[PDB]
From a paper:
We determined the structure of full-length Ssb from the thermophilic Ascomycota [name] in the open ATP-bound conformation and characterized its ribosome binding by crosslinking and mutagenesis experiments. After purification and oxidation, only the Ssb T208A-E51C-D534C mutant crystallized in the presence of ATP. The structure was solved at 2.6 Å resolution by molecular replacement using DnaK as a search model11. The resulting electron density map was of high quality showing well defined ATP and Mg2+ ligands, as well as the engineered C51–C534 disulfide bridge. Aspartate 13 coordinates the Mg2+ ion through two water molecules, and Mg2+ in turn coordinates both the ATP β and γ phosphates. As in the ATP-bound open conformation of DnaK, the β-sheet subdomain of the SBD (Ssb-SBDβ, residues 404–513) contacts the NBD subdomains IA, IIA and IB. When we compare Ssb-SBDβ with DnaK-SBDβ two important differences are observed: methionine 410 (threonine 403 in DnaK) seems to restrict the entrance to the substrate binding cleft, and glutamate 411 (methionine 404 in DnaK) may be engaged in polar contacts with the substrate. In Ssb, the SBDβ is followed by SBDα (residues 517–613, helical lid domain) that comprises four α-helices (A–D), with αB to αD forming a three-helix bundle. Ssb SBDα exposes a positively charged surface region conserved in all members of the Ssb subfamily of Hsp70s, but not in canonical cytosolic Hsp70s such as Ssa. Comparison with the closed conformation of DnaK shows that also in the closed conformation of Ssb this region would be solvent exposed and contacts neither SBDβ nor the NBD, indicating that it is available to interact with another partner.
Numbering used by the authors:
A (entry chain B): 4 to 387, 392 to 437, 442 to 559, 570 to 612
B (entry chain A): 4 to 392, 395 to 560, 572 to 613
Write the structure that this text describes.
Amino acid sequence: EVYDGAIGIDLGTTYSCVAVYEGTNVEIIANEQGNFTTPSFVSFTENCRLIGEAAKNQAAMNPANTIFDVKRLIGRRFDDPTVKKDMESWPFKVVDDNGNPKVEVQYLGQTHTFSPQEISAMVLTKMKEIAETKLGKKVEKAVITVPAYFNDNQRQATKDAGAIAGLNVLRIINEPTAAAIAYGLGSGKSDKERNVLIYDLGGGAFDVSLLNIQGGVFTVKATAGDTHLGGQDFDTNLLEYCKKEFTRKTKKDLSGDARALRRLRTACERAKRTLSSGAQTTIEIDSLFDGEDFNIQITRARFEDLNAKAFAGTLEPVAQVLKDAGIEKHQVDEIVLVGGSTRIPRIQKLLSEFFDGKKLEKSINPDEAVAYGAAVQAGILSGKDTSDLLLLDVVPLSLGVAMEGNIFAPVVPRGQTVPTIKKRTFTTVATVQFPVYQGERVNCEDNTLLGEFTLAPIPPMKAGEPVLEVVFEVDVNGILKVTATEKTSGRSANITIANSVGKLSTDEIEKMISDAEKFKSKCEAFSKRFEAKQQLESYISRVEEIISGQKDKIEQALSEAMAQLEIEDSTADELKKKELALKRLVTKAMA
Amino acid sequence: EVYDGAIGIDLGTTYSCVAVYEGTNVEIIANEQGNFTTPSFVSFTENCRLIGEAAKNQAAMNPANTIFDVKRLIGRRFDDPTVKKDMESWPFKVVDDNGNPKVEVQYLGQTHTFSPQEISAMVLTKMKEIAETKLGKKVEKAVITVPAYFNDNQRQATKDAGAIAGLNVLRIINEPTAAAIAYGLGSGKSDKERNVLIYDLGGGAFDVSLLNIQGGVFTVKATAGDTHLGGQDFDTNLLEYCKKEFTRKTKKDLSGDARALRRLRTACERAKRTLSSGAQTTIEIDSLFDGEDFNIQITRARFEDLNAKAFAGTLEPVAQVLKDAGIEKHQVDEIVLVGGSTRIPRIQKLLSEFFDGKKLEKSINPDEAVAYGAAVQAGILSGKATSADDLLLLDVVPLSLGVAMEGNIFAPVVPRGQTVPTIKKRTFTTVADNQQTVQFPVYQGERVNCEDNTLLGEFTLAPIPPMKAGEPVLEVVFEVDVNGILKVTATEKTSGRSANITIANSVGKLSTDEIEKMISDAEKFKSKCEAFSKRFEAKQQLESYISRVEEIISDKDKIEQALSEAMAQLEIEDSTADELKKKELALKRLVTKAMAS
Ligand SMILES: Nc1ncnc2c1ncn2[C@@H]1O[C@H](COP(=O)(O)OP(=O)(O)OP(=O)(O)O)[C@@H](O)[C@H]1O
Ligand SMILES: Nc1ncnc2c1ncn2[C@@H]1O[C@H](COP(=O)(O)OP(=O)(O)OP(=O)(O)O)[C@@H](O)[C@H]1O
Ligand SMILES: [Mg+2]
Ligand SMILES: [Mg+2]
């Protein structure tokens, strides 16, 4: 009853996708709606939580309790510029708690504040349950995907979200590398050394990788990208233009109604997807804001002009990854497209022009390749042809410490293969505390603080004589673990971390897990009791129509059933027992 | 550059699905949006025909010119009851042409009439195009799917639609048989004999089939169903309830607004999909009608109560298939589910209760199994699939084919359940001396009074050799080919001689001339659409160029003059792409010459 294998979960900004691999074939799993991709929406009702198409349908109906874009918010600090801007754009309310942002929603009649790891854990629970419906067994091992440019806080937060979802995260794989698994194994193969450029432009994140494929070894030569650039930004540009036309043609401004913003955003996304096939489209919506209809024509040229800066901007990480691995465009063997936004013809024309008219490779599915590769890797890691598979990934941004004058000291440089061990020596001015950052800027104020690290047990000596060996280890998941040991006096030194972000202690993870199980239990209770009360009331009505000693016993049992119908404390099982007892008694008396 | 194989297309009431099979694996092909199912919508504009989700998304904006549900109209007569009720519910205008229904739209600035075979042909051409970008070659052979209970007029109708789409219809395969191929070959195969029950509840049609599956032999033991029962009927019930509640809460009626009915219908389908998973949902749509908002809550029990008679009715064709096949409930080995509407938990509850709580088989994909099996049979028929996989299909006729006697009383000639292909005979004779004509109506169905059957047509047999009354023996032959289509012939066993047959008051039949002309019109429409794309894109590129050289020139008299000429050419709507490009080149010579100075 327990699935001994492992599933692959592509956790995307806009859509999530689950797949499974059993050694012979990889299958993408469809949800209860028949869709192989499930939107990453989580809405909150009075008694349950909606995830997927159900949550996205109730987005305009309840924008304050419909959560989305958690991927752009997970692992970040509350006062980062991107989350301040996003928070200005998002309709739901985000609060600051001890430096960590948490959304505030109305759930189960009370106010609740959820960390991004909890919401992402809800989405992961949904995908896992899709896999469980497909397999018919309990799923507990999984491989989860992250963008290649995710920093340490984001990867650790995503993995913790995988733990809250009740999954054993066997591996955190980079999405372009998983797509490389889908392309190199599927349409291709052959022990032929080839250079593959992976261009993954999704809904919220952007990645580009350069890999060397020799048989079964996948070697990431380089990678670049932007974890806050996707199709929703293009939707934002077209949305801003449409707002300018609305306030221009009606004098009214719709900026204050999140409902109207949601409907207009949906219309702009539909128009964008239409413009990838045609040369023009039209948006017509009723009321919108303050009872003012809207009708505008959008040309493909207008969309491309509105998104020219971003479309052209995507070429900068391409030249970046090209220079970092030291290869030229003539030497790039293939260019594979991954992500929905790659369906934009302007993007493909920019990439094809950049490589001097080279034709783009589009044999793999841009929506399922990531979950495909993740599923293959999970099936291999759980032992479920392809024994030569080797994954040599890379760290995207430098992991270092803050020097004197707050200058970035890289310990693990970008482009370092993974996993790796690095070491750096510290000493005392007379505990030792230093800030660990990640990024690529010289001044650490322009980098991502991994935290303030304090070394707890130090011997008492003169200044400079103790040598403190600090070890930065980066595992196959790409996550940093630091330790400390000094060569004089031997010994070990435990480390404490303050002012961190995206991490959760084991206690908090256990608490969130138990709370999740309690939520699901309450949902099953509400649904089963609801339907049971409906059925019981219907049968009671039929019995009343039928009746209109024995008479009195019937009427009394019917009054008990009505009482159980009025009491909210009644359980579905008790309701079933009452209905069955009614049927037994009425059949005995009638016969 | 022509694909030698064949594609399998599932032509559904709501969604169509294309697939290909070459010998090893069968691929379900995704469209331009990456979707494996494309909606069966065709909307007409001033310049082009939109097919698919591009047409479905503008259903609220242009409801009078957006066409759908033609699968419930194809092969039917204008005065059929279902055609009248559906016409009362449809926003587009349907017109009777000598009894044949025809969708009338505003297209290319002029009024246009289309037969259902033409619109179905447009959908089939869209799926064919999907397969063509997938394969990189032009395809011209295909196997098209029809419901098992489709009658003779309907089958001939969709086959002619496949001809109009430019395809060579190698076979007309029944949808539960294609799903049966998907389950018997794709889900898993055993050399053990098994009785498989297939329950296909789609968007507009309903089929139940019992097949004997023995390795590679697929034998249809029986089949029943209802070609006019689907999920859209449940959406119609919920919609009618929503109109009752709206009129109750506002004292106003939206039954006259087509856009309002479309928005409410979309919200009802969405609410049904949600109710398949949860126990309750909410419909909230603002400014639905007369500036009146609409907000109600729909419970699952309310939905099931609204569709209780139809849901309970789905079990009757299952009992019918069990009686016809001579099989008890215990002897059914697997119950496979096909069609999106099968996701309704009430339906699965009814089915499982009908078989004493037996678990239903959900191994195959309920949205792609039909295109799966159709693609398999297409690959085998085209010869592209060789050796790998003994596949044999033995199908039956769904309804009895017969004539009408004195008193309009049905006399069956080919009974239901008869294996295909088949040959049956029935004798006629004259009632007077030197009689030259014997005329009889051919019907399909099971009822005794042909008033409740489907008229295949008035068949006139003439002339007859001059003999005395009741002397000639007119052997009439009802032949049913592998597609399930009826061809009738006549002979006079005395002295042989083929006797000529004429058909009148038919439906779903087209002569070769009309089909060829419809193909030509399709070519003209695609040519006009591609032309419009060329003029539009060339126009936009010329605009961008004019703006660029305005920025450049404002940083010469011939460049200004050529600019004015280009703008004036840009103001004319009848400008060709070659003329626009010629003007852009005329500018380009001047500005590039000035750029080199
Ligand atoms: N035909 C199309 N034309 C243009 N854009 C499209 C098209 N189809 C999908 N998109 C865009 O692609 C995005 C979703 O693609 P994808 O599934 O790769 O996102 P994701 O993987 O969830 O995002 P991320 O990789 O950032 O986590 C959507 O934002 C959508 O707007
Ligand atoms: N999750 C769901 N719950 C309930 N109903 C659904 C669900 N998903 C789809 N449906 C219904 O199923 C229908 C689509 O099924 P399908 O694609 O089999 O139709 P079709 O093949 O076009 O119909 P037909 O076979 O009659 O031509 C839709 O009309 C929709 O209303
Ligand atoms: Mg992605
Ligand atoms: Mg169907």
